[PDB]
């Protein structure tokens, strides 16, 4: 918490450092939807995948996070932000607009880089949401307290590989389906494994629930990754 | 000299130096101690060196009444040990007027293990440089002896020996339950089995006691105590008419 | 050796010293001279006091504590008001609870435990200032002298701060001499600005130099400066 | 390197020795104390051409009959000032009557003492008059010692200033001279030439209080000191 | 008792709230307003003991427009009106509860329907068609029971008030020196200057 | 209770900490303000890391504190919303208990107070950010605009810039800015703006951002467009041989 | 007296690791090895009761701990860490879920509980992280039977097998090759067994080991009749006894 | 229940001339209709030529006139042995008396 | 809070160097009671004689004296004395002298155990007569302390431990009171021996069954004469 001969922040730039070694996750923004993909790190045939929660988490009913660092660090963030999303809607009878409760979590985190003594969390957050103010959003937080709003971003391992290819072919006009297609392409071209599985992957969609005019989260389940890995031509 | 060294963090192999000089801390005294269980009894021997003659011998001493019930002898230096002993006393007090029963030996052993942890673990306290080993005929399980060390390590024995010559004592003790094939001192009277402590503690040890080398506590149903230099002498009378 | 066991007061070195301790003391050696000394009537402070300039004032080294006590200092000067202050409070609670005048030893007791905390303290910084006390209680005139270590003695006669050892040893000799002086003020005080000379390379010492305080028996204490010293030098 | 308030073998406070070295850095104030007022002025030093020079604080009001020049890190006096300001205004609250000036210095020094992570950057010339003891001029240090002076100059350019002051400082100067003198002091060791937007006056006297000279005040005595100059 | 009467129309809210404010035997001023505007688009008027009303109104305002300047946003009526409750229903079990009723009318611009919001110092809260705080309360509510359409116009709502006021006029036992009424619509919030004499 | 002091002097009267932060403003985007004859005028720069970013919902450089007072920062943008949280909480408090909304001056005073405290309290390192804050006190017409630092200095400014290749930027202003002629339209005074900025930004893109003030509350945003009418008008017409 | 130490003494290295966490890894290596095995009506975990001299009493020691009726735990490392951990879960069972709903709670949040203290042991001042890596397993009505692994940083996750401390390697390498997701509760316990053998250098018998299961509800464990709604704790200590009778047939 | 108050009777006046001032009291102390003492003082010399009386309840009176003495003394120290002018003492007598606004001392005090 | 390899605490070990660097202190205890003596160094001239007390009283039946850093030594009292109202007030008789010494023992040793403190410069002789004896303590800078039958610490601590040695071996009888005092005047004599180079003043207290009523109480006057005497001349 203390400032380099440069201007930065040691215990923060160490702690980038550290979110770097971490399983990959991409968050992807269409005109209807957003994608959240991630990438466990190198499992095993014994870990349970069922109800195994690691990556992808639910913050409430219109927001979720994808999260790139240390797990426990990121459980004890999580539970906060719950909590604060359900005091503004206690306070308001509104659900929590999305940039709010990210300002918050970056607050949170800003913190510990001013004041205390103790070490930042080594966690980064892409947080998916809707509101009816600015619709369907994407964010990202990292250990600086820092956040900004994207159309389609990455986090942890391969971020410079990932956010060039997403920039080839992500367009304005897309649709959730492509923009699933896109998550799951770009994570096959940066993995580390020989190829990518479905045991390997967390995957999340807010889409705008077929007909009705409400906002629908859905946290894929085992089977259905690996059926949409076999649609877009990974089997 | 790297802070690990110095406050109780980890060392790249997994360690805590300032608990490991602790245990080394134990054996400053010099002193050996050992512990056996009769049929109904339980005993507890300690090596009495007063160099000094200016001192005052009825003071020296390294065994401690925590209760009625509950007798504790400490390896390791005086002030660390008369700690252990006051906190120990507190916790039995207070153990009886929150729950309406006398402490057991091995929970009061378990609190101050924990006690013990702690400092393992938080970086303002040094370890305390001891061993405590606690004793007693306990009201549901019988003769108790449960020691616990630095690291908040304890467990319960069959008997057990402390000190600089500890090995000696325990591989003896050890040699003497694989021919008896039984877990205990096979003896009615205490003083028998205080007979037997010392006659195992000269055999281990190579050496002959007087009335002022010992220092004996004995636990019996709802009653802890020390022998006086008299009965520990009428005890070396015994077991020079027969060893 | 003087290496790491320099850097707090909570610190001992492998000699059994306390240098931040030592240092504090230090911080006195470098401190303008002030001398005290009493007879069985009366006692009395000198202080040589030192400008920073030609055009600076003299700053004052003796503070009031009561009626009937009160202090010289030399050293660092804020350190002279906490402590002081401390024994105007001290003074004053004697006074209101118990309608008594504070004894002189048990303000050089009181002084010296205030130190002592500040010598075990992580944290803390002793004390950076010498303090000669006197006072005039139910046992007669009284001289302290107090050191930053938390050591206190009562004495005849002493001088601390820069080149004392001038001061001290006059007053070593002249000891049956002033001890006589009862009921005689003016010829203590005389004795007084004569022990602080044999401290000066320096130079005559003048009318904004000299700084004098005397407390007796139907004296209370008082401190002159300027136009009621003249007649001294 | 090893904490704030750490005795150096020499029986010196650490902490305390740098932030003088911090006021020497500091824009260049003077002040002067005689029997008609007493004056202070400052260097504004503008880092820049852009900077309009009648924002730049550096001297400023205390109590009617109490003013205060600064220098070093400007930025700490701030609650230096608030402090003096409330310590004058209770003073009168609690006892119907101005602050004495030594009274209020004493105060401003307590302050200092309570190191708060660090002592202060800024060293204080703090002047004013009381009925007790007239026109009076105090140096304030960070250290807690305060001292009084019938002149000084604290700041970069100060040891050329005080060997000026030495010199040309007597019993008997007008406040017009004294004003004079300061802004010679001032011309001589500033590192740019003195004009009404990088210099600024001050005074308090006993009838109208403490008063800054606005910048046409200013630059009629430099004007007037260009030619007390040329003749002589 | 103050008067603080709201009426909802079809396009808008109107308050209406007495102007006199009385200590004891004198009235001390006839031309009070017992109103803060809370945004652009709600306003809160307010009645109770002495000193807490206005503490309260103006505690209330300095949050509203903290949160608006913050997210360059308004709130909704429906929003503002649940942070005023759950205010007052923490006040009401603490040291000293703030002994103020409110009335809160906004206009909701997402929604585009306007919105009467009644809360007493319990922190009751409910929204109605018409609502009234005090003794006054006790003639309107039938009178507007009778007298009231769903969708009249702004005008229409202005002598619906009318005759509440008179009402009040009438069978009132002190005199609270006329009503100062005001409008919130779609176009924010205005003062009707000349309801007196009329 | 971790109050270990982290802001302190050097030997040669330096707080390191504070110098340390000033380099991390340096490290930032640049921010520049200029004042005109009825108004003042903001500028930023944007960066290039990426740039698959939506533009609606990242949080803008200039900062609304009341409806009349801007503030925007150089340095750590993290560290800002902090100053910029407790501004706002200020500016509201002060309507409360004066009946007034804020003067510039004191607004400012307030931020660099802040800053300031953040210099000699135990356990808490200083501000990386400065700051221009910009606006009109209510019910005049004076422009005002105030730069602070993390020392807590503070002081008004013709024009000012803060961050990457300020001294750059700054050069250029102090040539062209005449005390004796501030660019008297609100649009010239744009003009100046864009011009400094162009010399450090490359391309006045979807980078280069403005927002003018003028008295009574009266604040407007730029759009894209409306800059690349600013940009087109000196590239070509000050290309002259 | 007083706390000192207010900064943490887990940071972060220039290259990203966290050296105390890193260490305490290293601490849980040398540990006793440790294992749990999710077979389909129960879960089994077991370790070796290494003991320091055939003087101590290895009963009384507890390496497997009742943390629920339901819950298990059992650890590899430093045992006074493992202690202390098991009262502090054992607490907030209660504290943060029993005495607000009025039941146990489910294993994966008491699991989320533990994995909390340990982290907060990775971040607070003036202390270092926990030198143990736990093994939960449990059931509840709506996940029915799971199995936890914590580690020193408070991360979890999920397994069907798994072993911790010396051996660690090796046997997770033999539970693969034996584990199929149609297991009985025996099967489980004797793939146990098998694995242990390996870790192990001495004697091999049931009072070497210690082995717990959660399994079916033993109404003869609950201490009294006439609420036919529970049947009692899932969690069962093996005897001893239970434990050769296992190794004969082996 | 408990009364801190009580009433010790007496009676003091105050006297102003061009350049003298008078303060009076009678020497009796009572307690409802029995006498403590006919000769106990309740004006006091409070140093700098300042004369003060505090007269009610004796008990609150005591503390007061202690208080002052003391604010006097302290004064003194804090101010360079200033005179404490009667003006200056009257505002600070308002200020120890203000003090107890809510508990306050039973005394009708001159100076 | 560091213990260094061996298992010793390298700050409590700096601590006595301290005391061994102090003026020279003992206690013999008699058969009805306790003596204290010490070493006053002179440094000048100018100190006044009999008026710089080190001995101190704690309750009414307690002496304490001791070596190394003076003030060390004051805060100890002064949490004794606090020790000894707080046992009076809640079980009425005064402390018994073995609690009174495990008081100041968990105190000392309290001030081992943690990284912000230091621990005391100064070894503590202490006694005095309680309901069953005399009772005589010496207590080190580790909190270590045990009974005594003699005690010293300081620069001349050994030659004045011999002399303790001698005594106890050839009076198994026990010692009187008026006679502890004489023989504490002699030893304080040998112990100036290894400090020399000033010169020193003596002082002496006692707590005696019946030569003072189990009260502490300073030897001044007559019987201060006869023990500086009595000491004097076997140095002749």
């Not at chain 5, 702004?154 to 009438?170: A, I, R, S, W």
Request: aromatic letters at 8%; charged letters at 25%.
């Amino acid at each position: 918490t203390i400032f380099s001969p440069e201007g930065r922040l040691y215990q923060v730039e160490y702690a980038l450092e550290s979110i770097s070694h971490a399983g990959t996750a991409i968050g992807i923004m269409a005109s209807d939807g957003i994608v959240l993909a991630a990438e466990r790190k190198v499992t095993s045939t014994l870990l349970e995948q069922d109800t195994s929660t690691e990556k992808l988490y639910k913050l409430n009913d219109k927001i979720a996070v994808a999260v790139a660092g240390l797990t426990a660090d990121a459980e004890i963030l999580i539970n906060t932000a719950r909590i604060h999303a359900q005091n503004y809607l206690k306070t308001y009878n509104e659900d929590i607009p999305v940039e709010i409760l990210v300002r918050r979590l970056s607050d949170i985190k800003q913190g510990y880089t001013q004041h205390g003594g103790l070490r930042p969390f080594g966690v980064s957050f892409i947080y998916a949401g809707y509101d009816d103010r600015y619709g369907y959003q994407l964010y990202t937080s990292n250990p600086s307290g820092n956040y900004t709003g994207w159309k389609a971003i990455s986090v942890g391992a391969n971020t410079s590989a990932a956010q060039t290819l997403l920039q080839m072919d992500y367009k304005d006009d897309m649709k959730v389906d492509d923009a699933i297609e896109l998550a799951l392409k770009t994570l096959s071209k940066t993995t580390d494994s020989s190829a990518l599985t479905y045991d390997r992957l967390e995957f999340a969609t807010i889409r705008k629930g077929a007909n009705d005019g409400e906002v629908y989260q859905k946290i894929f389940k085992p089977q259905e990754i690996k059926d949409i890995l076999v649609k877009t031509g990974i089997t | 000299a790297g802070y690990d060294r110095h406050i109780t963090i980890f060392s790249p192999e997994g360690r805590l130096y300032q608990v490991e000089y602790a245990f080394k801390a134990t054996n400053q005294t010099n002193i050996n101690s050992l512990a056996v269980r009769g049929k109904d009894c339980t005993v507890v021997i300690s090596q009495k060196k007063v160099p000094d003659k200016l001192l005052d011998p009825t003071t020296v001493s390294y065994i401690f009444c925590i209760s009625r019930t509950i007798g504790m002898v400490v390896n390791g230096p005086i002030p660390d040990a008369r700690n252990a002993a006051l906190r120990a006393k507190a916790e039995a007090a207070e153990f009886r007027y929150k729950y309406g029963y006398d402490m057991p030996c091995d929970v009061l052993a378990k609190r101050m293990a924990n006690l013990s942890q702690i400092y393992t673990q938080r970086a303002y306290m040094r370890p305390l440089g001891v061993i405590l080993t606690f004793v007693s005929v306990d009201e549901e399980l019988g003769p108790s002896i449960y020691k616990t060390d630095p690291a908040g390590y304890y467990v319960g024995y069959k008997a057990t020996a402390t000190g600089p010559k500890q090995q000696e004592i325990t591989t003896n003790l050890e040699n003497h339950f694989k021919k008896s094939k039984i877990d205990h001192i096979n003896e009615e009277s205490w003083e028998k089995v205080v007979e037997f402590a010392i006659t195992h503690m000269i055999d281990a040890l190579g050496t002959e006691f007087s009335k002022n080398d010992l220092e004996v506590g004995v636990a019996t149903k709802d009653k802890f105590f020390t022998l006086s230099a008299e009965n520990i002498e009428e005890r070396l009378v015994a077991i020079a008419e027969q060893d | 050796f003087r290496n790491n066991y320099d850097g707090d007061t909570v610190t001992f070195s492998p000699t059994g010293r306390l240098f931040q301790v030592e240092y504090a003391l230090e911080a006195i050696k470098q401190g303008s001279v002030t001398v005290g000394l009493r007879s069985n009537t009366h006692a009395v402070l000198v202080a040589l006091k030192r400008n920073a300039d030609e055009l600076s004032s003299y700053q004052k080294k003796i503070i009031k504590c009561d009626e009937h006590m009160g202090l010289s200092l030399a050293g660092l000067a804020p350190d002279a008001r906490v402590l002081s202050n401390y024994l105007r409070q001290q003074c004053n609670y004697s006074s209101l609870v118990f309608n008594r005048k504070l004894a002189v030893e048990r303000a050089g007791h009181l002084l010296c435990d205030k130190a002592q905390k500040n010598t075990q303290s992580y944290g803390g910084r002793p004390y950076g200032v010498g303090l000669l006390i006197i006072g005039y209680d139910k046992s007669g005139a009284h001289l302290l002298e107090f050191q930053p270590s938390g050591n206190v003695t009562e004495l005849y006669g002493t001088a601390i701060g820069a080149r004392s050892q001038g001061a001290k040893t006059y007053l070593e000799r002249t000891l049956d001499t002033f001890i006589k002086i009862d009921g005689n003020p003016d010829e203590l005080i005389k004795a007084g600005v004569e022990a602080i000379s044999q401290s000066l390379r320096d130079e005559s010492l003048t009318v904004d130099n000299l700084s004098i305080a005397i407390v007796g028996k139907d004296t209370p204490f008082t401190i002159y400066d300027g136009e009621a010293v003249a007649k001294y030098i | 390197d090893r904490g704030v308030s750490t005795f150096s073998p020499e029986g010196r406070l650490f902490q305390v020795e740098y932030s003088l070295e911090a006021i020497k850095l500091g824009s260049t104030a003077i002040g002067i104390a005689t029997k008609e007022g007493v004056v202070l002025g400052v260097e504004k030093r503008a880092t820049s051409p852009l900077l309009e020079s009648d924002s730049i604080e550096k001297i400023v009001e205390i109590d009617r009959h109490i003013g205060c020049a600064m220098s070093g890190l400007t930025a700490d006096a701030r609650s230096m000032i608030e402090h003096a300001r409330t310590a004058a205004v209770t003073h009168n609250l609690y006892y119907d009557e101005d602050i004495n000036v030594e009274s209020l210095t004493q105060s401003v020094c307590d302050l200092a003492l309570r190191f708060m992570s660090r002592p202060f950057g800024v060293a204080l010339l703090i002047a004013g008059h009381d009925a007790d003891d007239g026109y009076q001029l105090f140096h304030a240090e960070p250290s807690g010692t305060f001292y009084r002076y019938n002149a000084k100059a604290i700041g970069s350019g100060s040891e050329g200033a005080q060997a000026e002051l030495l010199n040309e400082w007597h019993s008997s100067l007008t406040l017009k001279e004294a004003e004079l003198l300061v802004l010679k002091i001032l011309k001589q060791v500033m590192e740019e030439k003195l004009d009404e937007n990088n210099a600024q006056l001050s005074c308090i006297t006993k009838q109208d209080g403490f008063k800054i000279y606005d910048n046409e005040k200013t630059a009629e005595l430099i004007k007037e000191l260009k030619e007390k100059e040329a003749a002589e | 008792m103050d008067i603080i009467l709201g009426i909802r129309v079809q396009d808008s809210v109107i308050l209406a709230s007495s102007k006199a404010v009385t200590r004891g035997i004198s009235v001390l001023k006839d031309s009070d307003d017992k109103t803060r505007q809370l945004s652009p688009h709600t306003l809160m008027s307010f009645a109770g003991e002495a000193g807490d009303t206005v503490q309260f109104a103006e505690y209330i305002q300095a949050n509203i427009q903290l949160y608006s300047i913050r997210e360059d946003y308004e709130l909704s009526p429906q929003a503002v009106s649940s942070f005023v409750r759950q205010e007052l229903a923490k006040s009401i079990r603490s040291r000293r509860p703030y002994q103020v009723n409110v009335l809160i009318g906004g206009y909701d611009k997402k929604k585009n329907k306007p919105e009467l919001y009644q809360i007493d110092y319990l922190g009751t809260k409910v929204e109605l068609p018409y609502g009234a705080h005090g003794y006054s309360g006790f003639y309107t509510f039938s009178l507007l029971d009778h007298h009231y359409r769903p969708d009249m116009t702004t005008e229409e709502g202005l002598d619906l008030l009318k005759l509440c006021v008179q009402e009040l006029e009438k069978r009132m036992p002190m005199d609270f020196k006329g009503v100062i009424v005001k409008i919130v619509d779609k176009d924010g919030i205005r003062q009707v200057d000349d309801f007196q004499a009329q | 209770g971790y109050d270990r002091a982290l802001s302190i002097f050097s030997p040669d009267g330096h707080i390191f900490q504070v110098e340390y932060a000033l380099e991390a403003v340096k490290r930032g985007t640049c921010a520049v303000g200029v004042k005109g004859k009825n108004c003042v005028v903001l500028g930023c720069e944007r960066r290039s890391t990426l740039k698959l970013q939506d533009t609606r919902i990242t949080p803008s450089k200039v900062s609304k504190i009341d409806s009349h007072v801007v503030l925007s920062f150089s340095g750590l943008n993290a560290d800002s919303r902090i100053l910029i949280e407790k501004a706002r909480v200020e500016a509201q408090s002060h309507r409360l208990t004066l009946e007034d909304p804020v003067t510039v001056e004191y607004l400012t005073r307030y931020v660099a107070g802040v800053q300031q405290r953040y210099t000699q309290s135990g356990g808490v390192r200083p501000f990386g950010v400065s700051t221009l804050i910009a606006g009109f006190d209510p019910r005049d017409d004076e422009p005002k605009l105030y730069q602070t630092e993390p020392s807590g200095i503070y002081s008004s400014w013709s024009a000012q810039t803060i961050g990457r290749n300020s001294k750059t930027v700054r050069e250029f202003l102090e040539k062209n800015y005449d005390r004796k002629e501030p660019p008297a339209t609100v649009e010239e005074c744009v003009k100046l703006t864009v011009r400094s900025l162009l010399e450090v930004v490359q391309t006045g893109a979807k980078n280069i951002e403005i927002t003018v003030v003028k008295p009574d509350s009266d604040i407007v945003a730029l759009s894209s467009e409306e800059i690349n009418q600013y940009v087109t008008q000196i590239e070509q017409e000050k290309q002259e041989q | 007296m007083t706390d000192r130490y207010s900064f943490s003494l887990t940071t972060f290295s220039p290259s990203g690791k966290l050296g105390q966490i890193d260490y305490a890894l290293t601490a849980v290596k040398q540990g006793v090895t440790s294992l749990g095995i999710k077979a389909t009506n129960g879960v089994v975990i077991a370790t070796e009761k290494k003991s320091s001299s055939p003087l101590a009493m290895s009963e009384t020691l507890s390496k497997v701990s009742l943390l629920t009726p339901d819950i298990g735990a059992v650890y590899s490392g430093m045992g006074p860490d493992y202690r202390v951990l098991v009262d502090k879960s054992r607490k907030v069972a209660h504290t943060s879920y029993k005495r607000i709903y009025g039941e146990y709670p489910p294993t994966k949040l008491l699991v989320s509980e533990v994995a909390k203290i340990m982290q907060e042991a990775t971040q607070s001042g003036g202390v270092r992280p926990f030198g143990v890596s736990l093994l939960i397993a449990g059931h509840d009505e709506f996940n029915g039977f799971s199995l936890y692994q914590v580690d020193p940083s408070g991360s979890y996750f999920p397994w069907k097998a798994t072993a911790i401390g010396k051996g660690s390697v090796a046997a997770k390498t033999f539970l693969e090759k034996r584990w199929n997701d149609e297991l009985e509760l025996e099967d489980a316990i004797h793939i146990a067994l098998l694995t242990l053998k390996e870790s192990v250098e001495g004697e091999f018998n049931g009072d070497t080991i210690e082995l717990a299961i959660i399994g079916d509800e033993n109404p003869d464990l609950l201490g009294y009749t006439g609420i036919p709604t529970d049947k009692g704790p899932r969690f069962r200590k093996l005897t001893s006894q239970e434990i050769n009778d296992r190794l004969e047939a082996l | 229940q408990f009364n801190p108050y009580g009433d010790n009777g007496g009676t003091i006046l105050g006297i102003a001339g061009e350049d003298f001032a008078v303060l009076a009291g009678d020497t009796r102390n009572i307690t409802d209709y029995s006498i403590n003492s006919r000769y106990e003082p309740k004006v006091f010399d409070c140093g700098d030529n300042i004369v003060m009386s505090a007269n009610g309840f004796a008990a609150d009176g005591d503390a007061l006139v202690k208080r002052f003495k003391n604010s006097v003394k302290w004064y003194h120290f804090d101010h360079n042995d200033k005179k404490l002018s009667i003006n200056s003492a009257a505002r600070n007598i308002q200020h120890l008396l203000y003090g107890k606004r809510f508990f306050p001392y039973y005394v009708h005090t001159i100076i | 809070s560091v213990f260094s390899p061996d298992g010793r605490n390298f700050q409590v070990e700096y601590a006595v160097k301290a005391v061994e660097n102090g003026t020279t202190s003992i206690g013999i205890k008699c058969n009805d009671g306790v003596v204290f003596a010490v070493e006053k160094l002179i440094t000048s001239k100018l100190l006044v004689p009999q008026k710089n007390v080190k001995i101190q009283v704690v309750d009414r039946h307690i002496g304490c004296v001791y070596s190394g850093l003076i003030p060390d030594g004051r805060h100890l009292v002064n949490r004794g004395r606090e020790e000894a109202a707080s046992f009076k007030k809640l079980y009425k008789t005064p402390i018994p002298i073995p609690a009174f010494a495990d008081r100041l023992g968990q105190y000392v040793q309290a001030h081992t155990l943690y990284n912000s403190v230091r621990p005391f410069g100064v070894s503590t002789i202490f006694g005095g007569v309680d309901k069953n004896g005399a009772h005589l303590y010496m207590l080190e800078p580790s909190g270590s302390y045990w009974g005594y039958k003699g005690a010293a610490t300081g620069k001349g601590r050994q030659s004045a431990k011999a002399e303790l040695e001698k005594l106890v071996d050839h009076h198994p009888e026990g010692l009187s009171a008026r006679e502890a005092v004489k023989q504490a005047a002699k030893i304080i004599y040998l112990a100036h021996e290894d400090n020399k180079e000033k010169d020193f003043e003596l002082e002496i207290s006692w707590c005696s069954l019946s030569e003072t009523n189990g009260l502490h109480k300073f030897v001044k006057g007559d019987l201060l004469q006869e023990a500086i005497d009595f000491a004097q001349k076997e140095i002749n």
